[PDB]
Amino acid sequence: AQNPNCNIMIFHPTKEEFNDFDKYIAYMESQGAHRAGLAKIIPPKEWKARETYDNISEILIATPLQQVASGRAGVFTQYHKKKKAMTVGEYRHLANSKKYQTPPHQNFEDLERKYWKNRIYNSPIYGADISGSLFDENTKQWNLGHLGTIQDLLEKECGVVIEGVNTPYLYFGMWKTTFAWHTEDMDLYSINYLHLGEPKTWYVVPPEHGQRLERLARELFPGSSRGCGAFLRHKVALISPTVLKENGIPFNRITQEAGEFMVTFPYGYHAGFNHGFNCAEAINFATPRWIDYGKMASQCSCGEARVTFSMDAFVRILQPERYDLWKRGQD
Template sequence: MIRSNICPFPLCVQELLRRSKMASDMSSPNPDGRGIMTFYPTYEEFSNFSRYIAYIESQGAHKAGLAKIVPPKEWKPRGSYDNIDDLVIPTPLKQVVSGNAGVFSQYIKKKKAMTVREFRKMANSVKYRAPKHSDFEELERKYWSNVNKKRPIYGADVNGSLFEPNVKEFNIGNLGTILDTLEQDSGINIEGVNTPYLYFGSWKTTFPWHTEDMDLYSINYLHFGEPKSWYAVSSEHGKSLEHLAKDFFPESAKNCEAFLRHKMALISPSILEKHGIPFEKITQNAGEFMITFPYAYHAGFNHGFNCAEATNFASERWIEYGKQAVMCSCREDMVKFSMDVFVRKYQPDRYAQWLEGRDVVPIDHSQPTPEAEDRWKMSLCEGAHGVLGCKPHWSISGTHTHTHTHTHTHTHTHTHTYIYIYIFFFLYI
């Protein structure tokens, strides 16, 4: 007996209704994060990383520059963290911040190596631990009022992974995206870019405003410990942030067109709001993933001792960003690689033009990655088991925050209803 991939229409309507509710449950605007979407995949959906990134982009997650993914409860990256105390942090970084009135610059001093056990003891000591606070908002205020006082130590850029090798889903050491082309076709390995880095945080350790190397995506998993706060400016408003930063740091801008890649500029939310730069913020808790999107500026700080793991990845949508990325010209150690292999392999019809320098097109920041289109081409009801092939893209409720030059923020909530389902239903009848 041949079983059709197309289900009877009334059943498909019921399936769409059931799935649309599930999709609504799966993603939501976080009250803390306003326009940043939070997703709750099932274990099955979680099993294919690239496919799930395509899905969240189809829902518009990339438009905020940052998204959160909460793994299914049955998923674990590691059995225990009890055996990492002797792991060595080769070069802890003391962060020195100067400035005032919401605009600061940061430089680092390298410290001698220490173990995770030693770092945790230091981070939890009276000198380095977070002040008492009733909620995250109070802690955020204390962060910005004390950012240039005391000097926290960050266990950053530690080569390695805490994921067990047999973990197949969302394993930061083996994501399986098109960025793998860099190693497979060119033999290029760049630590922290196509390999994982570990980050051991303490209170007030900071990552200043920046986009990823080559304007790639990034993924950050908080293995354990205190939360991490994030700020994001979407790719749509990246140029506005750059212009503002050039005004605040004219000497740095004069010496390097891409000086924000130096990861030295701190600009507070109040300053962004004052100058009309739209931004979002969210808090990441232990056991949660954060995804940053191509050319999305982000910054943030740690609430206390914690451990995160991060790396970069790519989709076909990133290729245009990589081709147009503005690179730092003043430092030899800045990450840069040729886009040749990506254009030749994924944009063969444009390769000749690209070689001649004629392949320059405006980027539409609102469009999801092309892989998302392939996802929606799958049948509504797959095979004998009725496995979900896709989820209706109209089912997500989103909250969008627009920051104007006035010092107030307007929040509008747009809820999409299931009108199309009912139209199809009545047409069928």
């Protein structure tokens, strides 16, 4: 069995190996990468996402979100307060202001300590889930707006044409901006490219141990759990590495830097934070191996999670028994 300890693997494809996305994902899996829940991919030195980042300031962040925390330093929830629109140039200046800028620090581990100690006492502002792309149209390898669609994958595997589309999203972050513990919608893969700026630290639980995290989360968030059997789908709960270690939950950590891809695998719970101003692009994708995970994915039917149009068909075809209840939660 490859990668039996479920370590995060780091890959360095050549330019030739970077030509066929599906093949390279399947290669990484043949080496056991999926067992971690997360892998890093360093592009060949010949590759670039676009020529420059000098022309992105006029992108609009229509609904910046202030991430306000409740709880204790290692175990908290966050809610997202809506703020007035601002451009990427305005947001970059904000991020670099004395109120929001990264503090002085020694190394990534010192900054991690500061994050966990202090996050709850501040409310950083995040631009999230902005439909769009920063890949140049002439980047032909690993261009996140030209991947195979999940609807085409389901049709190829199962035979049924379905409605829906699959496009990328941009994320503009600052120090302390946080992504809560979650798996992807319908336990899909994700791919994330850090276009520019400061790093992103990730935490991940191996897929084979996902239910351990779920059981701890029900214990640590007991009102939320009573509310919804799949409340981690609300994307609001944070648990620190110290708390996970105290409770014997298997996990790993890694820091992504600008110019690097991360891939999350089906049913890999993950969470993390940004080190300072940055811009990432991300999209969900599928392979043949995902279908069995999509059929088994939990679902939020309480009303909170509210998702993309295109989840409808995945539930309808893969989970027909759950469809009627799930759809009531959407309405």
